[PDB]
């Protein structure tokens, strides 16, 4: 029994590079009672991994989630054939004792792709859902600003806000991505890389200002948004992608007189806070809404486990339209 | 009747200097029916005036609150001799229609100075009260970080926090202020100017982190504190005084990966949000606590209305121990 695994050969300095990763082949032990051998079917790459990777030692396996098939079982809860979510990292095969795994929703249809369990009806959809519904606390009627809005979190956020009856303003890094989010029914979408002035564009997009800001990117982009927040505006801090790969100091912060005069609430959050019933209800909603056509999905599938570092690097550069997913 | 008024001659570049202010003498109109003539007894200077003054046109009067006596009345609610809070700016005499004024508390004793109405039992005490009890929402048993902690706002925050059963860690700018706050019963107090490393002082002062941070200073000081916040820690953003007089770009914002990881809540506030009964219950709670000795106060009184800019500059530059009042 053999496995292939991507390790961190070297801590990243700015953007990752091929030389910071190393593929190692390895013999997997035999199964003890209560254990299963899992075969990776679909592996995800996500922005957080740029950040989570600083917590690793050189030689450690890259963290990450997958959809795996149980190929060998000594666990009666999980027979051969069973499909599960698992986070053994960037690895083709892994041994699990059962207790770190998740079967899919019972009601899960054959008419949707299994890899949605890693996207829209998985962790990024849950991030959108809870960030928007619990942290921004949108009610309906509100004007929501969402950035990295063609990203896996962003695009779900906007689609949930539309079906709660909000105006949604979305910012995007490419013109393919602009067209895509207009198909999905966002009120105003623009390419931030091409606009002459973010300030003027955001002003023309909601002259009123923004009730809510779902922030994925941070930096000077967020400083500009903060200057057009309505009084008692709410900000959900989900990520700061524009900062993860920097080589210098952080940009200036939110201009503090504006934050104070406007009495803003900013609250940061991580998806994993919500477990139990709250989480299962959220998943079931994301499933409902997908099947009703209220949330549309798109995937960028890269064939082959050899191509994972490239998938990650591509996603980080903004090269891909859809959730990046490696088939394997 | 004449008045003297301090105007903004020139917009401040970094700190103010004397030449940015101009004293003018002006004749006042006779009173119409329902109006009163106010003579200033005590005027305040406050950090926010540095920020607010950026919104003035040159020639404009400096903004600010005072304790004033009604010396001429055509208003039956406000007979000669009545003491009021008023905000005509930095002027010795002004005219009111009476509807923008505030009489002192009914139960206001002779055994305290009138000028506490501009400080501890006034705007800065209210700032502390609501920032701490509503925004930080301290319940008791929590460790509170307060900066500019021997200032008008910070010293009250610390004393209310003590009396609600919190550990209080205060940062201060002089060793006289360190001494003073230790007499007031703060748990840890230090001089942020003398300490070798802020990071390490905060780490020894609360090994377990900070539940709440009442933030008056902002900038790099705050970035260091954020690195020490407990998970789900609460920041009340009240001011950012370290930035008001700063001549360059703003310093690096708070490090987003830590904010997100710790799921921090930051909320900005202005005192004038709380009005009506809530505001009155707070003024009565503050005055009660003063009489009981649970809140001590220190004033730095400066004689003469012509000394008001120097007073302001001395306040901004950390010159003084106690609330800066001009008699006036
Ligand atoms: Cl078993
Ligand atoms: Cl099988
Ligand atoms: Cl995007
Ligand atoms: Cl963007
Ligand atoms: Cl993605
Ligand atoms: Cl009258
Ligand atoms: Cl009189
Ligand atoms: Cl300080
Ligand atoms: Cl101080
Ligand atoms: Cl003061």
| CATH number of the domain within which B18 lies | 3.90.180.10
Closest CA to A163 of A209, A128, A210, A119: A128
Same domain, B63 and B110: yes
Same domain, B231 and B89: no
Residue B124 Cα to ligand 8 midpoint, Å, equals: 17
Residue B51 Cα to ligand 7 midpoint, Å, equals: 35
Q: Classify strands A167-172 and A188-191 as parallel, antiparallel or unpaired.
A: parallel
Give the largest Cα separation in chain A, rounded.
64
Task: Give φ, ψ of A258 to 5 degrees.
Answer: -75, -45
Residues in contact with A224: Cβ distance below 8 Å, sequence separation at least 6, in sequence order: A198, A199, A202
What the block records as the tokens of A125 is 């959809």
What is the DSSP secondary structure assignment for residue B132, as one 8-state letter? I
What the block records as the tokens of B38 is 């106010």
Q: Are B154 and B178 in contact (CB under 8 A)?
A: no
Terminal CA-CA length for chain B: 17
**Which residue matches tokens 């310093």?**
B251
What is the DSSP secondary structure assignment for residue B54, as one 8-state letter? G
Query: HSE on the CB side for A112, CA within 13 Å?
Result: 27
Considering only CB atoms, A260 lies closest to which of B239, B257, B261, namely B239
**N residues, chain B:** 328
B102 DSSP β-pair partners: B85
For residues A144 and A136, what is the distance between their CA atoms, to the nearest angstrom? 9
What the block records as the tokens of A165 is 């009856």
Sign, CA dihedral B319-B322-B325-B327, equals negative
Q: Are B129 and B286 in contact (CB under 8 A)?
A: yes
For residues B247 and B174, what is the distance between their CA atoms, to the nearest angstrom? 23
Q: Are A102 and A75 in contact (CB under 8 A)?
A: no
Closest CA to A50 of A242, A245, A215: A245
Same domain, B104 and B201: no
Burial class (CB in 10 A: 0-12, 13-18, 19+), B204: exposed
For residues A69 and A78, what is the distance between their CA atoms, to the nearest angstrom? 10
Residues in contact with B185: Cβ distance below 8 Å, sequence separation at least 6, in sequence order: B159, B162
Q: Are B149 and B157 in contact (CB under 8 A)?
A: yes
Same domain, B68 and B96: yes
Q: Are B146 and B222 in contact (CB under 8 A)?
A: no
Closest CA to A221 of A237, A244, A198: A198
Residue B116 Cα to ligand 7 midpoint, Å, equals: 21
Residue A205 Cα to ligand 5 midpoint, Å, equals: 26
Sign, CA dihedral A238-A239-A240-A242, equals negative
Q: A99-131 as b/e, with b when 16 or more CB fall inside 10 Å?
A: eebeebeeebeeeebbbbbbbbbbbbbbbbbbb
Strand, coil or helix: A216 = coil
Which chain B residues touch A251 with a CB distance below 8 Å?
Answer: 252-253
B157 DSSP β-pair partners: none
What the block records as the tokens of B174 is 């002089």
Which residues of B does the annotation place in the binding site for NADP(+)?
151-154, 177, 192, 216, 238-244, 269-271, 320
For residues B181 and B174, what is the distance between their CA atoms, to the nearest angstrom? 11
Same domain, B189 and B284: yes
Same domain, A80 and A131: no
Which residues of A does the annotation place in the binding site for NADP(+)?
151-154, 177, 192, 216, 238-244, 269-271, 320
Residues in contact with B242: Cβ distance below 8 Å, sequence separation at least 6, in sequence order: B217, B218, B219, B220, B221
For residues B230 and B212, what is the distance between their CA atoms, to the nearest angstrom? 8
For residues B180 and A6, what is the distance between their CA atoms, to the nearest angstrom? 58
Resolution expressed in Å:
2.3
For residues B49 and A77, what is the distance between their CA atoms, to the nearest angstrom? 68
Q: Classify strands A36-44 and A323-326 as parallel, antiparallel or unpaired.
A: antiparallel
The CATH number of residue B258's host domain is 3.40.50.720
Residues in contact with A267: Cβ distance below 8 Å, sequence separation at least 6, in sequence order: A135, A234, A235, A236, A237, B263, B264, B265, B266
**Which residue matches tokens 């905060």?**
B202
For residues B50 and B326, what is the distance between their CA atoms, to the nearest angstrom? 17
Same domain, B201 and B243: yes
- Virtual CA dihedral for A145, A151, A155, A156, nearest 10 degrees? -110
Task: Give φ, ψ of B141 to 5 degrees.
Answer: 95, -10
Which residues of B does the annotation place in the binding site?
151-154, 177, 192, 216, 238-244, 269-271, 320
Sign, CA dihedral A242-A246-A250-A251, equals negative
Residue B118 Cα to ligand 9 midpoint, Å, equals: 18
Q: Are A219 and A237 in contact (CB under 8 A)?
A: no
Domain count, chain A: 2
Considering only CB atoms, A253 lies closest to which of B239, B254, B263, namely B254
Same domain, A144 and A259: yes
CB atoms under 10 Å from CB of A183, counted, come to 10
Task: Give φ, ψ of A7 to 5 degrees.
Answer: -110, 160
B95 DSSP β-pair partners: B37
Considering only CB atoms, B256 lies closest to which of A240, A262, A265, namely A240
Residues in contact with A138: Cβ distance below 8 Å, sequence separation at least 6, in sequence order: A132, A144, A161, A164, A166, A211, A212
Q: Which domain holds residue B33?
A: 1-119+298-328
CA distances from A255 to A53, A54, B28 (A): 30, 29, 40
Interface test with A, best of B221, B260, B262, B265 (most A CBs within 10 A): B260
For residues B248 and A312, what is the distance between their CA atoms, to the nearest angstrom? 37
Q: Are A325 and A119 in contact (CB under 8 A)?
A: yes
Q: Classify strands A323-326 and A299-302 as parallel, antiparallel or unpaired.
A: parallel
**Which residue matches tokens 């931030």?**
A192
Same domain, B165 and B263: yes
For residues A290 and A163, what is the distance between their CA atoms, to the nearest angstrom? 12
Q: Are B224 and B203 in contact (CB under 8 A)?
A: no
Same domain, A90 and A184: no
What the block records as the tokens of B83 is 């003491």
What the block records as the tokens of B62 is 């400096």
User: Using the beta-carbon criterion (under 8 Å), do B269 and A255 form an inter-chain contact?
Assistant: no
Closest CA to B269 of A267, A259, A224: A259
Query: HSE on the CB side for B88, CA within 13 Å?
Result: 25
Same domain, A249 and A153: yes
User: Using the beta-carbon criterion (under 8 Å), do A260 and B252 form an inter-chain contact?
Assistant: no
Q: Are A16 and A50 in contact (CB under 8 A)?
A: yes
For residues B288 and B224, what is the distance between their CA atoms, to the nearest angstrom? 36
Rg (CA), chain A: 20
CB atoms under 10 Å from CB of B287, counted, come to 23
Strand, coil or helix: B48 = helix
What the block records as the tokens of B59 is 């020639």
CB atoms under 10 Å from CB of A306, counted, come to 12
Same domain, A74 and A178: no
Strand, coil or helix: A18 = helix
Residues in contact with B171: Cβ distance below 8 Å, sequence separation at least 6, in sequence order: B145, B146, B147, B148, B149, B189, B190, B191, B192, B221
- Virtual CA dihedral for A282, A286, A291, A294, nearest 10 degrees? 120
Helix or strand holding residue A189 (H, E):
strand A188-191
């Amino acid at each position: 029994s053999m496995t292939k695994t991507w390790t961190l050969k070297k801590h990243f300095v700015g953007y990752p590079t091929n030389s910071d990763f190393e593929l190692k082949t390895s013999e997997l032990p035999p199964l003890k009672n209560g254990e299963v051998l899992l075969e990776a079917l679909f592996l995800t790459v996500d922005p957080y991994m740029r950040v989570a990777a600083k917590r690793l030692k050189e030689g450690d396996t890259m963290m990450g989630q997958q959809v795996a098939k149980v190929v060998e079982s000594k666990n009666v809860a999980l027979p051969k054939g069973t499909i599960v979510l698992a986070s053994p990292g960037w690895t083709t095969h892994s041994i699990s004792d059962g207790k770190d795994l998740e079967k899919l929703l019972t009601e899960w249809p054959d008419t949707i792709p299994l890899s949605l369990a890693l996207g829209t009806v998985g962790m990024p959809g849950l991030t959108a859902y809870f960030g928007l519904l619990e942290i921004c606390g949108v009610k309906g009627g509100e004007t929501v600003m969402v950035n990295a809005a063609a990203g896996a979190v962003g695009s779900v956020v906007g689609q949930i806000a539309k079906l709660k009856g909000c105006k949604v303003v979305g910012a995007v890094g490419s013109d393919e991505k602009v067209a895509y989010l207009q198909k999905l029914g966002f009120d105003v979408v623009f390419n931030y890389k091409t606009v002459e002035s973010l300030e003027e564009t955001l002003k023309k997009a909601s002259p009123d200002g923004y009730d809510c800001y779902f922030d994925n990117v941070g930096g000077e982009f967020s400083n500009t948004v903060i200057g057009q927040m309505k009084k008692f505006g709410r900000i959900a801090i989900c990520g700061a992608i524009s900062t993860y790969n920097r080589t210098g100091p952080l940009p200036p912060g939110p201009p503090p007189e504006i934050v104070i005069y406007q009495e803003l609430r900013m609250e940061a959050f991580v998806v994993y806070r919500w477990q139990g019933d709250a989480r299962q209800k959220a998943l079931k909603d994301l499933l409902k809404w997908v099947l009703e056509g209220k949330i549309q999905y798109k995937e960028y599938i890269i064939e082959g486990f050899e191509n994972m570092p490239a998938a990650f690097m591509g996603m980080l550069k903004g090269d891909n339209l859809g959730k990046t997913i490696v088939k394997a």
